[PDB]
Design a binder for this molecule. Structure first.
Ligand SMILES: *[C@@H]1O[C@H](CO)[C@@H](O[C@@H]2O[C@H](CO)[C@@H](O[C@@H]3O[C@H](CO)[C@@H](O)[C@H](O)[C@H]3NC(C)=O)[C@H](O)[C@H]2NC(C)=O)[C@H](O)[C@H]1NC(C)=O
Ligand SMILES: *[C@@H]1O[C@H](CO)[C@@H](O[C@@H]2O[C@H](CO)[C@@H](O[C@@H]3O[C@H](CO)[C@@H](O)[C@H](O)[C@H]3NC(C)=O)[C@H](O)[C@H]2NC(C)=O)[C@H](O)[C@H]1NC(C)=O
Ligand SMILES: *[C@@H]1O[C@H](CO)[C@@H](O)[C@H](O)[C@H]1NC(C)=O
Ligand SMILES: *[C@@H]1O[C@H](CO)[C@@H](O)[C@H](O)[C@H]1NC(C)=O
Ligand SMILES: *[C@@H]1O[C@H](CO)[C@@H](O)[C@H](O)[C@H]1NC(C)=O
Ligand SMILES: *[C@@H]1O[C@H](CO)[C@@H](O)[C@H](O)[C@H]1NC(C)=O
Ligand SMILES: *[C@@H]1O[C@H](CO)[C@@H](O)[C@H](O)[C@H]1NC(C)=O
Ligand SMILES: *[C@@H]1O[C@H](CO)[C@@H](O)[C@H](O)[C@H]1NC(C)=O
Lengths: 120, 117, 433, 432, 119, 102, 432, 118
C-alpha cells in the first residue's frame, strides 16, 4: 500500500550510480516489482523489472547493459544498480507495483521517484 | 513470503514455500498433548505412505478423472491451494487409503522370497 | 498413463476451527497470565485472499468470557467468608458533622461471635442503603441484601483487579487471522487479511452502558449489529475519537476491622469525612454533543428518517439501568439519563456506590468489596456505546451480558487450523529401483 | 533353510489388558458422559478367532463400578447439606386421608436455625419411620438415623439421575472384543468374536434382587455362575422373555420447604392425600409361574434330582432383604416373599419407602431423597434374577454388591491391547 | 486381519498402525489415557529406529533365524498359521531376538562409522 | 508506437473535453492497455485498470490497436497528464507524452 | 578442504538442572510413595570426572521439604476439626495419686455442643498447661492457644506418620550424580562421582538441636558450613559414631471420648497414673563427653586458638530452645542444657509434652496430637548436631528451618539434565 | 564426559532411556511425562531438519569455522573430554545449528528442482 524510492545517487555522465527502493504495507514478494523513469519533459517508460516472487529479471533494451534490477524480497526492498550513465539519464526513477502474483501485470501504483544527475 | 504467504498464490507458485491454577494446569496439559498428537499424526501418515522426510512425495497411485477431470495446466496455474482443497475435499480419504495400500504392496514385493531386492 | 498422485507437505491451507488459546502478557491477571508475549511479534500480510468473519459467532469471545469467570472465582476463593456476618442488624440514620446527613447510609449494630464460641460482642459499621434490606414492617431491623440467596465472600484487600493488557495466543498448529479492513462491520468477507500468532493487548475492562478504555475505530464511526433492523439485537457503536470521562468519590473513608473468626477479618466502613456528594462523573458537554451527533449521522444511513431519539434505559436493576464501572477499586453505578435524553462546559452524572457486588448474572456467588481508604479519582476513555433500539426510532443505553464488551475488541480476529498436508496430480511416477 | 529375521510393524495381535475407558452418549449421565457416540457404529467380524472371555474377572465391571459411584458423589457434592436438621424431633402420629390412621409416618416438630444466625423457628415435616430413630424409651424425642454416623447431603431436584444407555469406548491403541455366542456361559472360549470400539449402551439401572430393564438373552435362559457347585457364589439367571412389572404410590404428596441458610433449603413432606396402602408392585399371574417354570427347568441341568426350593431372603438389612429400586427419584423397598415361596390375574407385593439412602455399600455417604409431589407410577421389565443357593436345594433372592448387576451385560466384552510389533523368518537377508 | 494367515495379513499392516493414535478427576484420567497412548506409540517407533528399521512396515535384518526359536519351514508358518498363533509359538525368545537386533545394528552403525567412507 | 499518444488531447477548456487518444500494436496484441495520470511534478496514479476496466472517473475503451480515455468533462481536477501504456512481450509500450489542461 | 561439522547423538554430557523428582519406596509415607524402587540400582562410576557440588544450594532439599509439607497437610484433611472446642475453659489443678500434685496439668471443664445441635453438655478434659493461655487477667478462665490465630485439625487416629526410608528418583532424561568422597565438605569439586537412578533411603525425621536416625559419616567427623567464618550460618556436625539416646514417658495415660459432631470426637486426655516425671531422656555421660571432645578437635581446625565453649540455646520458643521430636504419637521438648555446657554413668535430660503442635511453623495451621494410651519409650541414634557459632568461640545448639535436617542426607546428591546432542569438526564432507 | 572426547560406541542406551526407559500430584506427574516426550521430540525434530533422521551420527556439508575453535583435529579428538568440548564451543551452538539448517535447506531445494521420475 506504500513505497518510496531512495534518494537518487547523482553522478557525472558515464559514471556509476545506484538506485534503491523501500516497500511498505505489503508482502513485497507476491507482486512483481518494476522501474520506470521520466526524462525531463517526457513521459516515463519502463527501464527494468524484477520477478520479485522469484529470482528472474528483465530489462528494457535501452538499459539492458546500463542497469540492473533486483528484488530484496527478504528485506521488503528493491534495487537497481547502474553504470555508464547516459548523459541523457537524468530521469526521475519511480518504483512500481506490477502486481500479477498469478497473472495480468499492470503498473498498479507508483512511488514518488527520484532523479540522479547525469552530469557533474 | 512468510507463513501462509502463498495462500493467495497459484498452486504452482505456492509449491516454492513448502519449506516455511488447577483448571489452568488441565488446559495447558491438553494443549501440549494435542500439539504432540497433531505432530505425530502427520508423521505417522507420511511414514505409512513411505515418504517421510520429504516435502514432495512422488507416488505410484494413478490420478482418477473422477476425483478431478481438470488438466495440469489448469490445476497448477488457474487455482490456489484453498480452492483445490475444496474441489477434492470429497475423495481425500480415498486417495489416502490408496496411498497406504500402495506402500504396503511395495514393501511386501521387496521382500519376496524368490525375487527379494 | 499420466497424472500420478503426488503428496505435498507445507501447503498453505486452513480450516475454521475452535481451540484453546493461551493467555500471555499482586495483580490477578499478571499472576495468572504469567506467560510472556513475543517482544517482537510478526504480522504476515496475505496477499490476494478473502476471508469470512463473523464477530457475533466468534468463539474467542466465549472463551475469554469463561477464562475471566474462572479467574475471578479463583482469585476470590481463598479469602474470608462473611457467612457469620448475618444477624439481624439494628440500624439508624448515618450522620456527618452537625446533622442527619448521609442520605445513602445507615449506622448498623450487631451481636457477632468473637474469639470464643460462647461469647458475642456488639460491633457496628456503616452500610449503604443499596446493600441492605428491611426485614419487616417499618422496623429498624435489617439484613444484608444477599444473605438469603448466597454466601458473600470478602475480597482479599491485597489483590489487584486492575485490567492489564492481555494477549490471546494460538497453540501450535493454529493461527489467528486478523481483518484489517478499516470499515469492516463485523460480518462478511474481508479483503485485507493478515496472520498473527497473538492478538493485540486487550484490557478486560468491566462496564455496562458505556464501553471504556477500548481501541478506537480506524475509520469513521462504525455501527455494528448482527442484524441492525432487528429490535432484538444489540447495537455496538464504535467511536473513532474518545470522549474522556473523569469521575470521582470526594470523600475520605475510614476503615474499622472486625474479627469474625480465627484469623478472619471483616473490613468495614467506620466513618466518612468529606463533601456531601456520594460520587459524580464529569463529561464535556460540547464533546458529548459532537460525539452523539456524529453517531446519529451514521445511524441515519440505516434509518434515513428524521425520527431518531435517545431515551434513558427501561426499568431493571443497576446492571442495566446505570453505567457501571470499577474506579480505584470502588464500584460505581452512574445515572446516564443526562447523556441519553435528546431528539434528532460539562454535564455531571450523579453516581451511587455499592459494596456487595453480584458481578455477572450468576447469583450463586457474591463479593464484598472492602472499603477503600481516602478518596478516589480516575479518568477513563469512552470508546464506544452500547445501544438497544425499539413511527420513530428510539435508542436507549441498554446493554448485554458483558460479552459485548469483549466482542468490541475481538471482532477482527478468527481462529483457524492449519492443514499442511494435501495432494494433487502431477506428470511424474515414483521411480522404484 | 537359510532364514533371516524380518521385523514387522502393524501386526494384528493383542494381549489382555485393563485400561481407562471413556463414555459416549440436567441429566447427570448426559452431563458427565458428554462425548457423542458414533452415529453409525462399526463392527468387524473376526473369522476363525478364538478368544477366552471371563466375566467374573472382567475389569470393565470394576471400571463401571468406580465411575458410577464417583459420578454420584460429584453430582451430589455441589448441593444442600442437611447438617442443621440433627436436632431433637418431637414426633407424634400423622393424620392420614381421614383421621390418624396412617402407618409408617410420623409428624415431627423441631427448632431450626433460619437464614439469620440469631433466630430459630419452629418447623415441622412428616417423616417415614424407616428414616427415624428414637432417642430414649417412652419418648416422643427422635433423631434422623444418619446423625449417629454422618451429616448427609440432599439431592437437588435440579438434576436427574434417570439412567440412559452408556457406551463404554476404548482409547486409541486398544480395542474391545465382543463374544457373539448366544449360549455363552461367561467363562469359556468364544468361537464367534467381533471387534467394536464402543459397547452397545448399558443403562446403569440399580436394583437388589430382580434385574430390571436389561437386554434379554438371544437364546434360551442361561444360568451363569463362576462355580455352580459352590454355594458361596452368585447365580445370575438371564431370562430370554421379560416379565412386566408395574409399581405405584397412589397418594398425592405435598412438597414444601424449610429454609436453613443463604439459598439453602430442605424439602419437607406435608399432608399427603390419597390411599394409605402406600406403595405396591403388580407382577402378572401365570407369567411369573411360567417364568420360574422355565428357570427351574434349566436349574435342573445342574441339580438333576429336582427338589428345588425357593424361599424369601433369609434376613439382613432392608437393602438386602427387599427389592430395591429407584422409581422416578423415589426409593422403593418391595417385599418379594410372595414370589420366592414354592417347593418343586396378578400378585402384588407391598413396598416401603425411605428418604435417607445409604448408597452402595457404605454408611456415612448417605443421601436425602426429597419428596416428590403428587402420585407416581413406574413400569419396568424384569430381565434377570439374582439367586444365591444354600437332600433338597434352596434358592434365595439374594444379591451382590452392585457389581453383579453390571456383570450381567459386561460379559460379552473384553478389553485387549494392540501389540503392533513382532518378528518372523523370511528367506531374504538385509543387504547394503 | 487377525483371523487370517501370516503373509496374507501382511497386506493389512497399515490399518493396524493408523488406529494407534488418537471435573479434574475425569480430566486427569483422560490426559493419562492420551499420554499413555503417545508413550506406547513412541516406544515402538524408537525401538524400530534402534534396530535399524525406522519408518518402515517390513524390514529385513542381519540376524539369522534358528531351531532354538522355532524349527519351521517358511511354507509352514507363512499362509498356514495366524499371527496370534505365531506369537504364542515363539512366546519367550522375543527379548533375545530384540537384543540381537540391537546388537546387529550397533555393529552396522559401527562399520560405517569406522570405515569413514565420505564424499 | 509510444501509444501514438496525442500530444495534447486531454488539454481543454473548462467544463468539457475530448477523450485522450491512444493507439498501439501492443493494444492490438492483448487487452492489457491501461491509463495512468499525473499532476505536474507528481508520480502517476492508475487512471484505469485497463482501457476497458475500472474507468471510475470517466469511461474508457479499446478497439484493438485503438484506445481512448473519456474525459471527466474538464473538471479542474482533470488537468493531469493522461498517459497510455500496454503490456508487451517484455515490459510495456508507453505514451511519449500526454498534455492536459482544465 | 578439511574441517567439517559432524553431528553426534548420545554424547555423554549434562547440565545442572532443577526438575521434579519422584518419590519411591495407614502410613502416609507409604501410601503416597507407592512407586517401588529398583532393588539393585547401579552406581556407574565416572572415570576421572570432577563435578562441583553445593549442599547449601541443593534443589533436592527444597523438593523434599515441599513434598513433606504437602503430604503432611494432605493427610490431615479428611478428619475432625476441633473448632467447636474454642470455648471458655474453667480450669483447676489436675489430680492423680496423692491429690493436686501434678505440675503442668490442668483439669478443665467446658460446655461443648453434643451430637444434636440443640443440646449442650458439660465435659471435662485433662490438658497440658503449655497449650493453655489464661484469660481476663489472673483468673480461673482459660483458652486453648490455637483459637487466638487458627482452627486446629486433629491428627487422624488411624494415620501413622512414622518415617520410612524415602528414595528420590530421577525422571527420564535426568540423572542423579552422587559424590563418593568420604571427606567431602558439602561444596566444591568432588573427584569421585558416580551416577545413580535413585538416592539411598532417607527417613523424613523431624528434629531441632540434635539430628536423629541419619547415616553416619564415612570418614572422620565432618564440620559442614556454607561459610565457617560467618556467624550467620548454620554449622552441621556430621558424626562418624552414633550416640544412643533413650527417651521415655513412664506414665500410664488413658483417654476419653467426647463426641463433637455426627461421627466426630475429640479424644481428650482422661487420667494419668504412674511416675509423675512427665518424660525425660537418658544419654550416656562418657559417650557424650568423648563425642563432644572429638567434635571440638575438629572445630579447632577452623578455630586454631583453642578457645571453645558450649552454651545452651539462647532464646525464643520451645521449637528453638529445646530438642524436639515425635516419639510414637507424642511431641517431646527436652532441655539439652545438660549437654551444651562446657569449656575446652548418664545424664538425664528433663522433657515436656505438648498436644497443640505448630508443625513446620505454619502459624495459620495447627495439629492436635491425641494422647497415646499407656506408657512409651523410644530409642534413637544421634547422628549429628546443629550448632550456631557466636576471644572464646561460643557454640550453641539450635536448629534451622527444617531444610538443614535434610541437607545432611542430600549433600552428596546433585540433579543433572542429560543433553545427547552435540557437534565436533571432522575430516569428512557429506557424500552427495 | 564419562570418558575422553572419543566417540562412544554405545549411543542407544542413552536414547532408549528417554522414553521412560493428590489431584495436584497427578498434574505434576503428567507434566513430567509430557515434558519428557516434548524433549524427546524436540531433539528428533532438530535432527530431522539437518537430514539426520534415523542416524546416530551425520556427516554434513557445513565447513567448520576456525573462529569456533582455532584448533585442529588432533587438538580435539582424544585430547579433550566431551564436557570440555561442549563448554569450549558453547557460544557457537546456535550458529552451528543455524548453518546446519541452511545447508539442509539448500540440499532440499536441490532435489526439488531436479526430481527423478520413472
Ligand atoms: C492491509 O493490512 C496491512 C497490515 O497487515 C496494512 O499495512 C500497514 O500499513 C501502514 C501504512 O498504511 C504501515 O505504517 C507505516 O509503517 C512504516 C514501517 O513499516 C513506517 O515507516 C511509516 O511511518 C508508517 N506509516 C505512518 C503513517 O506512520 C504499517 O507498518 C503496515 N503494517 C504492516 C504489517 O506492514 C495495509 O496498509 C492494509 N491495506 C489496505 C488496503 O487496507
Ligand atoms: C457371529 O457374529 C456376527 C456378529 O458379529 C453375526 O453376524 C450378524 O448376523 C445377522 C443375521 O443373523 C445380521 O443381521 C442382518 O443384517 C443385514 C444388514 O447387514 C440386514 O439387512 C438384515 O435385516 C439383518 N437381519 C435381521 C434378522 O434383522 C448382522 O448384520 C450380522 N452382523 C455383522 C457385523 O455382520 C454372525 O451371524 C455370527 N455367527 C454365528 C454362527 O452365529
Ligand atoms: C457506633 O457506636 C458509637 C458509640 O459511641 C457511636 O458514636 C457511632 O455513631 C456508632 N456507629 C455506627 C455505624 O453505628
Ligand atoms: C430474601 O429472600 C428471597 C430469596 O429469593 C429474596 O428474593 C427476597 O428479596 C428477600 N426477601 C424478601 C421477600 O424481601
Ligand atoms: C402436623 O402438625 C401440624 C401442627 O400445626 C398440623 O398443622 C399438620 O396438619 C399436621 N400434619 C399431619 C399430617 O398430621
Ligand atoms: C477363515 O478360514 C476360511 C477357510 O476355512 C477362509 O476361507 C477365510 O478367508 C478365513 N477368514 C479370514 C478372516 O481369513
Ligand atoms: C476433674 O474434676 C472432676 C470433678 O467431678 C473429677 O471427677 C475428675 O476425676 C477430675 N480429673 C482430673 C484429671 O483431675
Ligand atoms: C499400662 O498400659 C499397659 C498396656 O499394655 C498395661 O499392660 C499396663 O498394665 C498398664 N499399667 C498400669 C499401671 O495400669
Amino acid at each position: 500500500x506504500x513505497x518510496x524510492x531512495x534518494x537518487x545517487x547523482x553522478x557525472x555522465x558515464x559514471x556509476x550510480x545506484x538506485x534503491x527502493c523501500x516497500x511498505x504495507x505489503x508482502x513485497x514478494x507476491x507482486x512483481x516489482x518494476x522501474w520506470x523513469x521520466x526524462x525531463x519533459x517526457x513521459x516515463x517508460x519502463x527501464x527494468x523489472x524484477x520477478x520479485x516472487x522469484x529470482x528472474x529479471x528483465x530489462x528494457x533494451x535501452x538499459x539492458x547493459x546500463x542497469x540492473x534490477x533486483x528484488x530484496x524480497x527478504x528485506x521488503x526492498x528493491x534495487x537497481x544498480x547502474x553504470x555508464x550513465x547516459x548523459x541523457x539519464x537524468x530521469x526521475x526513477x519511480x518504483c512500481x507495483x506490477x502486481x500479477x502474483x498469478x497473472x495480468x501485470x499492470x503498473x498498479x501504483x507508483w512511488x514518488x521517484x527520484x532523479x540522479x544527475x547525469x552530469x557533474x | 513470503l512468510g507463513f501462509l504467504g502463498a495462500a493467495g498464490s497459484t498452486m504452482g507458485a505456492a509449491s516454492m514455500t513448502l519449506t516455511v491454577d488447577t483448571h489452568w494446569g488441565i488446559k495447558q496439559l491438553q494443549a501440549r498433548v494435542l500439539a504432540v498428537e497433531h505432530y505425530l499424526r502427520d508423521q505417522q501418515l507420511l511414514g505409512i505412505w513411505g515418504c517421510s522426510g520429504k516435502l514432495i512425495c512422488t507416488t505410484n497411485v494413478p490420478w482418477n478423472s473422477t476425483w478431478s477431470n481438470k488438466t495440469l495446466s489448469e490445476i497448477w496455474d488457474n487455482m490456489t491451494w484453498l480452492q483445490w482443497d475444496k474441489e477434492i475435499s470429497n475423495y481425500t480419504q480415498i486417495i489416502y487409503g490408496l496411498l497406504e495400500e500402495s506402500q504396503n504392496q511395495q514393501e511386501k514385493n521387496e521382500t519376496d522370497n524368490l525375487t527379494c531386492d | 498413463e499420466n497424472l500420478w498422485v503426488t503428496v505435498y507437505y507445507g501447503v498453505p491451507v486452513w480450516k475454521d476451527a475452535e481451540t484453546t488459546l493461551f493467555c500471555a502478557s499482586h495483580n490477578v491477571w499478571a499472576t495468572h497470565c504469567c506467560v510472556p508475549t513475543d517482544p517482537n511479534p510478526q504480522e504476515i500480510v496475505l496477499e490476494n485472499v478473502t476471508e469470512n468473519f463473523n464477530m457475533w459467532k466468534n468463539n474467542m469471545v466465549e472463551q475469554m468470557h469463561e477464562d475471566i469467570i474462572s479467574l475471578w472465582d479463583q482469585s476470590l476463593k481463598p479469602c474470608v467468608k462473611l457467612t457469620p456476618l448475618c444477624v439481624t442488624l439494628n440500624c439508624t440514620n448515618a450522620t456527618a458533622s452537625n446533622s442527619s446527613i448521609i442520605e445513602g447510609m445507615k449506622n448498623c449494630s450487631f451481636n457477632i461471635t468473637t474469639e470464643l464460641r460462647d461469647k458475642r460482642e456488639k460491633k457496628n459499621a456503616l452500610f449503604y442503603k443499596l446493600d441492605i434490606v428491611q426485614l419487616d414492617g417499618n422496623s429498624s431491623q435489617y439484613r444484608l441484601i444477599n444473605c438469603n440467596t448466597s454466601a458473600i465472600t470478602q475480597a482479599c484487600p491485597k489483590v489487584s483487579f486492575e485490567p492489564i493488557p492481555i494477549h490471546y495466543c494460538a497453540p501450535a498448529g493454529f493461527a489467528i487471522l486478523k481483518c484489517n479492513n478499516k470499515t469492516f462491520t463485523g460480518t462478511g468477507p474481508c479483503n485485507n487479511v493478515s496472520t498473527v500468532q497473538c492478538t493485540h493487548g486487550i484490557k478486560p475492562v468491566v462496564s455496562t452502558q458505556l464501553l471504556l478504555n477500548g481501541s478506537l475505530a480506524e475509520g469513521e464511526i462504525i455501527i455494528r449489529s448482527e442484524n441492525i433492523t432487528d429490535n432484538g439485537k444489540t447495537i455496538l457503536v464504535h467511536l473513532n475519537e474518545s470522549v474522556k470521562i473523569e469521575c470521582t468519590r470526594p470523600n475520605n473513608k475510614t476503615r474499622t476491622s472486625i474479627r469474625i473468626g480465627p484469623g478472619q477479618a471483616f473490613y468495614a466502613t467506620g466513618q466518612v469525612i468529606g463533601d456531601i456528594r456520594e460520587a459524580y462523573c464529569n463529561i464535556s458537554e460540547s464533546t458529548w454533543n459532537e460525539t452523539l451527533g456524529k453517531v446519529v449521522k451514521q445511524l441515519r444511513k440505516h434509518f434515513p428518517h428524521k425520527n431518531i431519539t435517545f431515551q434513558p434505559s427501561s426499568g431493571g436493576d443497576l446492571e442495566v439501568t446505570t453505567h457501571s464501572f470499577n474506579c480505584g477499586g470502588e464500584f460505581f453505578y452512574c445515572n446516564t439519563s443526562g447523556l441519553f435524553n435528546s431528539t434528532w462546559d460539562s454535564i455531571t452524572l450523579p453516581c451511587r456506590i455499592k459494596q456487595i457486588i453480584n458481578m455477572w448474572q450468576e447469583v450463586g456467588r457474591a463479593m464484598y468489596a472492602p472499603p477503600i481508604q481516602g478518596n478516589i479519582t480516575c479518568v477513563s476513555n469512552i470508546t464506544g456505546l452500547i445501544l438497544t433500539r425499539d413511527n420513530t426510532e428510539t435508542f436507549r443505553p441498554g446493554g448485554g451480558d458483558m460479552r459485548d464488551n469483549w466482542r468490541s475488541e475481538l471482532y477482527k480476529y478468527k481462529v483457524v487450523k492449519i492443514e499442511p498436508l494435501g495432494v494433487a496430480p502431477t506428470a511424474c511416477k515414483r521411480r522404484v529401483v
